[PDB]
Design a protein around this ligand. Structure first.
Ligand code: CL
Lengths: 13, 348
């Protein structure tokens, strides 16, 4: 998907 | 352990420039005019996001002007601003230093979607209610955000606090003064924007918020498509072909075009069978062709879908307090003050 930030605690995609 | 200092102006309150020091910078995202950095303020240890926008040497920057005026618990706070060089040679950039929030509604949604699981409805209520409060607040100044989408809904996942961000498209709309139609992002654009209208109102944000709600209930965007014609086909498959009266309320230049002829799909068949009926009912009053028939943000806050939030004993699933929900101001309630009877329950 199209994410605001490089990283997230919810995983990568 | 590099420390950087700059002279910057606080985002609210005193216009007096101050020395501000920060450290631990690291790249976290990409902006239209340069990379986005996280930093840690030396005085407090608080994390900030710093984003760059191009300074127009003939007009003062609308996003800064808007973000200095706003003070609301569901809107990201401008801490400081200052000017610098940047990616393009010879250009001056405005740097906006914002309170950092680590997640977004979009990340949470994709997390559940990829797991093939339904976002718990309590979170759907919390997020949407907070989004509608932020809209009620900005709309009360005449300001339309014009780019509502899940990636602009910052989220503290533990506290469930939502903050609206990215005011780079926002504008104070004035009836009778035209506006560009080419704002708002794919999947979230109201049909009058797809139709190129220049005389729209803040109700375009309410359409976009209904698209976010539907996406949280579906696990995917409700009106996808890479072109306006593909998006419109998805809208018509749900709402049915718009009538001539409806097209004239969106953009009267489009009344006589040939549109796909489709009967509306029943709202109860759009979502999965166990979708709560109040969520479907709310969505049907947000995703309306006629812009003036859409709920206002304050009316959406008062909708019965959010009644659980007004119950004295509601907690997050992790046992925490709900975030602040009832600290309305006079400003925020000014479009319709006596919704307060619904909006501020007796225990608040
Ligand atoms: Cl995101």
């Amino acid at each position: 998907x199209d994410f605001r930030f490089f990283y997230s605690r919810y995983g990568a995609c | 352990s590099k420390v950087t200092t700059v002279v910057a102006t606080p985002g609210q309150g005193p216009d007096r420039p101050q020395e501000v020091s920060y450290t631990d910078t690291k790249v976290i995202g990409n902006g239209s005019f340069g990379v986005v950095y996280q930093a840690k303020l030396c005085d407090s240890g608080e994390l900030v996001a710093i984003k760059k926008v191009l300074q127009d040497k003939r007009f003062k920057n609308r996003e800064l002007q808007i973000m200095r005026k706003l003070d609301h618990c569901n809107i990201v706070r401008l801490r400081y601003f200052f000017y610098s060089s940047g990616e393009k040679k010879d250009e001056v950039y405005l740097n906006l230093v914002l309170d950092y929030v680590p997640e977004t509604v979009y990340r949470v949604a994709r997390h559940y979607s990829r797991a093939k699981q339904t976002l718990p409805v309590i979170y759907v209520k919390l997020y949407m209610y907070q989004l509608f409060r932020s809209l009620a607040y900005i709309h009360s100044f005449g300001i339309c955000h014009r780019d509502i989408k899940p990636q602009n809904l910052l989220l503290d996942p533990d506290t469930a606090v939502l903050k609206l961000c990215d005011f780079g498209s926002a504008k104070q709309l004035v009836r009778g003064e035209p506006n560009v139609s080419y704002i708002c992002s794919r999947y979230y654009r109201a049909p009058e924007l797809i139709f190129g209208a220049t005389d729209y109102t803040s109700s375009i944000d309410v359409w976009s918020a209904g698209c976010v709600l539907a996406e949280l209930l579906l696990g995917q965007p409700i009106f996808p498509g890479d072109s306006g014609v593909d998006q419109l086909v998805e809208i018509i498959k749900v709402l049915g072909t718009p009538t001539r009266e409806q097209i004239r309320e969106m953009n009267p230049n489009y009344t006589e075009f040939k549109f796909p002829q489709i009967k509306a799909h029943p709202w109860t068949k759009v979502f999965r069978p166990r979708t709560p009926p109040e969520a479907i009912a709310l969505c049907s009053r947000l995703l309306e062709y006629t812009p003036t028939a859409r709920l206002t943000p304050l009316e959406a806050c008062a909708h019965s879908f959010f009644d659980e939030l007004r119950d004295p004993n509601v907690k997050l699933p992790n046992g925490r307090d709900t975030p602040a929900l009832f600290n309305f101001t006079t400003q925020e309630l000014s479009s319709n003050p006596p919704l307060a009877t619904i909006l501020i329950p007796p225990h608040a």
